[PDB]
């Protein structure tokens, strides 16, 4: 449930139609600490076990308290671990529809690896979604150099990492809402456009 490892273990005589990357917050355990797995219930609800794989950023993504400070608010280790999966998700999988997400240093994460990959790749994620987006100030809501339509941040009133601030408090832990509800329907909404569109041509 907390880790889940289904592209690294995975083989390309099994590819599902949507692989899912995402980034866990600092301090929280396995690869997807507490809001991972709900996403991961509500994609795997729609497409079933076997139509999406799941895939937390763990390995040099040690999810440190002090990377937060970094200016892109993470290390190039971790973005390295991300864009490994963004890669590994392209070769095994070619024709697999992307999604990513992440939560706090893991949305920083997800953002500077979705920037930094391949562009072949960044057209293939359809959508990202971002919870207690540790840059939001800085990258004034957007991930830089993809669509803000594919782009979605969840931002509570109150949680002051959104509005530039180094400072947890209490509104920053509480996505649960989010992370089970319009976060998985906006992936959804865009893997099934981006999967259509395939399927026409």
């Known amino acids: 449930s ?8 995975g083989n390309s005589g099994s590819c599902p139609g ?16 507490t809001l991972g797995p709900r996403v991961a219930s509500k994609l795997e609800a729609k497409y079933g076990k076997n139509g999406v794989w799941i895939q937390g950023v763990g390995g040099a993504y040690r999810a440190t308290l002090g990377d937060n400070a970094l200016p892109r608010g993470t290390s190039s280790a971790a973005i390295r671990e991300m864009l490994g999966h963004f890669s590994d998700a392209n070769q095994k999988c070619p024709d697999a529809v992307l999604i990513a997400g992440g ?21 293939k994620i359809a959508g990202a979604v971002l919870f207690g987006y540790t840059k939001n100030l800085q990258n004034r ?13 969840f931002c509570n009133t109150g949680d002051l990492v959104c509005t530039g601030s180094l400072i947890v408090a209490a509104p920053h ?21 981006a999967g259509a569109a395939a399927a026409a041509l």
């Open 141 to 153: 809501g957007k991930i830089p150099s993809y669509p803000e339509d594919r782009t979605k941040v």
């Open 173 to 193: 832990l509480a996505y649960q809402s989010a992370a089970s509800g319009a976060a998985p329907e906006f992936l959804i909404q865009k893997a099934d456009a």
């Open 18 to 33: 949507v692989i899912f990357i995402y980034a866990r917050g600092s301090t929280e355990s396995g690869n997807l600490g």
């Open 103 to 123: 939560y706090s240093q893991g949305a920083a994460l997800a953002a500077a690896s979705v920037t930094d990959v391949d562009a072949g790749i960044r057209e």
């Open 2 to 9: 907390i880790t889940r490892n289904d592209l690294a273990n």
